[PDB]
Design a protein around this nucleic acid. Structure first.
Ligand SMILES: [Zn+2]
Ligand SMILES: [Zn+2]
Lengths: 136, 283, 285, 276
RNA sequence: GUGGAAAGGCGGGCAGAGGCGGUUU
């Protein structure tokens, strides 16, 4: 349940570390279905809350996905990947857990047809941030 | 009674943010307090509601400071007393701020005939009960220029994330806040269209509209301008009177005021009779 | 038999689904505009001694609808004898108050064999409020207006049974004029405008004495089973009197209908259409 | 009496975000089935008539010679005395507002407003010559709705007290700026003398619509409609009986509402003026 | 020889008032 994790979230990061390491084991683009994509995003944001990371520290990376989202939608990716690395540099600590999910997705995206795979990548990255606030 | 059309005065120019502005509305990631944006292009504009509403506001306080002086020029300004109807919850108890909207009192004339004499409600309109005096101006929504749209293409920053803090005085603990702000220097194509309904007193409305603009260049434009977020500036591109014949024959022979590198204070004080001398010849 | 199906593809809303007498009015106004008054005198004589049209019926993506015959109400229990008696009652009244049937189910109702109703209707009658504004002091004073809105592929068709030489000279030029003016209703707001296509439809009807009308008829004698549609009209700004028509799906026994001429005090005579359009039916016992 | 139908086809572009409204707290008019907005034929005809009646109200003295039915009217409305048609231009009262509608066939035959838009009258009528079809979205602006983009947006406006700065918000659903619709106007050529004056008057009211607004708030900057003309076809009297393409087509790809009357009416329409 | 002919869902309404990204060891 998505609502059941909020009763337990409010050493506990280790029990969800197997869920994050399994999701980081699968790195192919569109390797999960539509319902399975959002089910991965619940496990990500619950893992990103036990060792909690604020959205601001991420906010520069979230800017570069969104300004491209207007440029992809009837209007490059290495500019976001260069920022996703450099923002993960000045950690302190849980920025590496967020880097282990972006950089497998962005290495496949690095060479990819632009119109489809980024618009499918953009739906997963919303639900990570979207669900992160639902738990805190 | 007797609505007539003589033509339109169209004012085109560039609103410039000398300091970064903020209008704002109540995306997933983003600043807590963002700025209004165009839903199709994602660029932050300036609405015509926010520009007309601030000009009507600043012109109403300009009347209450001089109700002794404006009363001899315009009838139906002796219908009331200076102040607001805020204590006595009455729609017409003899004050200038007579109509409440939901909780706040705004000067609105209640009848068509008293709105044709008020300087605030000739230019901006009334909507009383059984009355409905329509406005004589149209204030379009103000989008970015063709120059500052190319700056968004090249990667230059249009917006900004200004961070402010309110400090508790006794314990010195800080509460932080973030507010989206357009980068200072950005420019906006605005447009203001006055309908020449009466050739008697079109000249008073142009002086009253340009008076309110120079008040708005002294005050701010939306969103916490006591802290710096205003300092806005009108730069006039073109000034143009489209005569009624213009719409008949379609020819581009419609009379023009140069208005080049001239301020809102130059159009009223320096050369109002020199510039508008040729508009008067056609009317 | 084989009919010509004049398919009217909507460009917007319709005021109403046009009856057979307001199609013949609209065709008759189209002929005097294009040709003149001498060709209306030959258009009327070709329908008195010949061809007949029907009312307008909806379609929805090559699923042509036809009116339910009035023969299936007396014998509705006799049609549904082979059905479970705990649900014969709700099946009966749902089948009874239905208005249209498609071609598969319209053929089965003429032979009193079991059938089903459509689940979706291809249109909705919509209440759109309009306003009237004072020119000077813009006082709003609203009124309410009814329109038929269609789906993305739905529309309106009507049938034609007659010789090809009359269709090629009168009905086919009228529907290109009537595509650009309206087909009844507020045509100044773009209501009633449409694109016309021509097809051919086949109905397998049993041979008997009794037959259903697919149009309003103004019968010459007493019918067998019927539904009274009481309508008048308006002709060049002159009010037509309310006449008792018969509805679509009513059952006659060798009744041609009859075309009524009303003086109406107008430059020319006004003919109101009123003619049958028979397909054979089997009545109950 | 009938001669043909001049058909004007073009694209209506919402340069600023448009509102018409049906009664998010103030929803715009939509289709009942798909849910897309449009522009009604009543809103576009009723605005072109309203803009052109104020145009004729200002020129009643100068147009008595060309239009002989304007000698009976003085500029103003019959509202200050609750009385029907007597001298004032805005003579007909429908429910609570006053409109110029001519009272007869023979008077509306020589009125610039009512020979084009029509008149109700009593004991006689005058039907319209134009048909202003509804304007739905283009096919290009329909797959953006299919892809998932917003075709309407929520504009939240507030009302500020002048003494206390008390804020009072409200919402207004608004068709997104930039969106393009497709219009059509069908002018019925009833009289071969009256048609040049009727197309010029229709294009004049379309030129007043580009500097005024269309529906909604407008004074707060909503309407701002731009007209792009795809084509002009004539469809003569001989087209309707034989069906062969005798359609005289006037070509306009980037022509404005002003450039179709910027001496272009006399030039481009040289063939419709030929075949009458 | 069209249950027709005529009729802008519209007038007025600032997303705004307050707030030292710096404390403290
Ligand atoms: Zn006033
Ligand atoms: Zn008239």
């Amino acid at each position: 349940v998505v609502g059941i994790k909020k009763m337990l979230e409010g050493q506990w990061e280790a029990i969800q570390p197997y869920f994050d390491n399994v999701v980081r084991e699968a790195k192919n683009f569109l390797e999960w279905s539509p319902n399975k994509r959002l089910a991965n995003a619940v496990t990500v944001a619950a893992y990103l809350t036990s060792q909690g990371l604020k959205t601001n520290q991420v906010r520069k990376i979230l800017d570069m996905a969104r300004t491209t989202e207007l440029k992809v939608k009837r209007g490059k990716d290495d500019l976001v990947k260069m920022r996703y690395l450099l923002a993960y540099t000045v950690g302190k600590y849980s920025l590496d857990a967020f880097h282990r999910i972006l950089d497998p997705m962005l290495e496949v995206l690095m060479g990819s047809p632009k119109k489809e795979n980024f618009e499918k990548f953009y739906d997963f990255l919303q639900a990570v941030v979207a669900y992160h606030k639902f738990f805190g | 009674m007797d609505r007539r059309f003589y033509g339109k005065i169209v004012i085109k120019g560039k609103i410039k943010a000398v300091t970064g502005l903020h209008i704002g509305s109540q995306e997933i990631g983003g600043i807590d307090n963002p700025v209004i944006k165009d839903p199709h292009t994602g660029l932050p504009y300036i609405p015509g509601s926010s520009l007309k509403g601030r000009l009507r506001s600043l012109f109403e306080i300009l009347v209450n400071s001089r109700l002794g002086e404006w009363r001899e020029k315009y009838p139906s300004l002796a219908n009331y007393s200076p102040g607001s109807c805020r204590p006595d919850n009455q729609e017409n108890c003899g004050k200038f701020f007579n109509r409440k909207i939901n909780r706040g009192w705004i000067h609105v004339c209640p009848d068509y005939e008293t709105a044709l004499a008020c300087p605030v409600c000739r230019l901006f309109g009334a909507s009383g009960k059984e009355s409905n005096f329509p406005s004589r101006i149209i204030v379009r929504d103000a989008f970015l220029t063709k120059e500052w749209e190319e700056k968004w293409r090249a990667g230059e920053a249009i917006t900004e994330a200004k961070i402010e803090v309110g400090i508790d005085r006794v314990t010195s603990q800080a509460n932080p806040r973030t507010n989206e702000r357009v980068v200072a220097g950005a420019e906006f194509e605005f447009e203001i269209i006055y309908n020449v309904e009466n050739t008697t007193h079109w000249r008073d409305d142009i002086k009253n509209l340009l008076t309110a603009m120079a008040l708005l260049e002294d005050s701010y434009l939306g969103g916490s301008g006591s802290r710096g977020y205003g300092k806005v500036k009108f730069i006039f591109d073109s000034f143009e009177f489209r005569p009624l014949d213009y719409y008949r024959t379609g020819k581009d022979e419609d009379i023009v005021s140069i208005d080049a590198r001239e301020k809102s204070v130059s159009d009223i004080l320096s050369g109002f009779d020199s510039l508008f001398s040729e508009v008067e010849g056609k009317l | 038999p084989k009919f010509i199906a004049v398919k009217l593809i909507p460009k917007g809303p319709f005021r109403d689904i046009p009856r057979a007498d307001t199609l013949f009015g609209a065709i008759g106004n189209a002929i005097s505009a294009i040709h003149g008054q001498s060709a209306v005198e030959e258009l009327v004589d070709a329908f008195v001694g010949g061809a007949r049209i029907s009312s307008a019926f909806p379609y929805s993506g090559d699923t042509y609808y036809l009116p339910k015959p009035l023969s299936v109400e007396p014998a509705l229990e006799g049609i549904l004898t082979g059905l479970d008696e705990e649900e014969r009652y709700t099946t009966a009244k749902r089948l009874r108050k239905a208005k249209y049937l498609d071609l598969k189910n319209f053929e089965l109702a003429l032979r009193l064999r079991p059938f089903t109703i459509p689940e979706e209707i291809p249109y909705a009658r919509v209440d759109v409020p309009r306003v009237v504004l004072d020119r000077v002091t813009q006082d709003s004073s609203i009124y309410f207006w009814e329109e038929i809105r269609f789906r993305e592929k739905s529309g309106v068709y009507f049938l034609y049974s007659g010789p090809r030489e009359v269709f090629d000279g009168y009905i086919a030029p009228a529907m290109r004029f009537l595509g650009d003016t309206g087909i009844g209703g507020k045509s100044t707001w773009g209501a009633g405008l449409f694109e016309v296509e021509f097809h051919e439809m086949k109905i397998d009807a049993p041979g008997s004495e009794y037959s259903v009308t697919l149009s309003n008829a103004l019968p010459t004698k007493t019918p067998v089973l019927w539904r009274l549609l009481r309508k008048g009209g308006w002709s060049f700004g002159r009010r037509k009197p309310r006449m008792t028509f018969i509805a679509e799906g009513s059952i006659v026994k060798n009744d041609p209908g009859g075309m009524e001429r009303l003086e109406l005090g107008l430059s020319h005579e006004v003919y109101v259409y009123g003619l049958t359009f028979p397909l054979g039916v089997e009545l109950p016992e």
